[PDB]
Design a protein around this nucleic acid. Sequence first.
RNA 1: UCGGGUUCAGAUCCCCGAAUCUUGGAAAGCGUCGCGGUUCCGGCGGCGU
RNA 2: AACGCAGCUAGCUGCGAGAAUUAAUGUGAAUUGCAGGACACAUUGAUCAUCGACACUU
Lengths: 116, 122
Amino acid sequence: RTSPTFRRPKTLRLRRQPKYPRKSAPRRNKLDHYAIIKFPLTTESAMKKIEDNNTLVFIVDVKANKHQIKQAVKKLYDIDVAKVNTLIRPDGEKKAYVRLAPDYDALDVANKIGII
Amino acid sequence: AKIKARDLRGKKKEELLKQLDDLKVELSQLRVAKVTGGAASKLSKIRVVRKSIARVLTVINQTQKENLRKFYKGKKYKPLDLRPKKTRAMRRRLNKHEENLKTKKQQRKERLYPLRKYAVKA
RNA sequence: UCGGGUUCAGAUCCCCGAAUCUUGGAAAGCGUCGCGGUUCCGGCGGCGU
RNA sequence: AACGCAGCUAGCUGCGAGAAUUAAUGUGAAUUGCAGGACACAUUGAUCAUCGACACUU
């Protein structure tokens, strides 16, 4: 003993091996891509963005982050996303500005939803 | 054309998700019709299509459970949601076996002196 | 992380361009002088800085 | 306790992202303000009630 202080010795710690799972089955993912996108938006100011900025406007779930929004729109409408800008409306809904890649165009795509 | 619960029960798991997926897809399209100009006939379809989501999702959730029930039917330990719920207090009481447990002293007592039926003339 | 544009309402957040004395830079912007168009052209030029 | 959920919906009420309800059983042609949707009513089903299955955001 070269030190005057006594420290608690480190002992073995076993990883928990439950005899049974406390939850019978994994909880289902209740916030999916269809939950990510609520509906597209059609206001007058919105239309300017699809034409001049190659950007789509969407009302999304308030709990979705920018990464979650980007993946959902890609697999929902088979397009590529450059960047997404989000804000929380005064009414409490989250609005997302999703800008498509330059190779895709928002005009023909927004026809496919039927919004444009 | 009308989704009904009992015909979906015997249907296999894989296409149930396939049945779930498109119904979600039509539901998304109906929401697109709402924000734009929407026909009244179209605006009637959200409620029915929403209930089919519940109807289908109820099936899988109902379908998923009993396999876990029969999987754990004979096992010593069950998941907490598969055990009987009842009431918190009623789960703490002694099981029917213990409340019938009786000591050696009493067993000698009841066999030696059983309660008898009798009548008194008057 | 700045410059210039952009809305009826947002800009160091949107778009463009640059990043983390000269290159940037004149192409921009700003003054004036004109030509097109009249809910379309959000299109053109001339000088000067 | 909060926040959301109705085709048109603020409150009350009901409900919980399956959100003015899912399943099942009983019942048996409606709900209703408007429209739409329904509706062989067993080759089995609107509404309501019951409620034991499932689900139940912070």
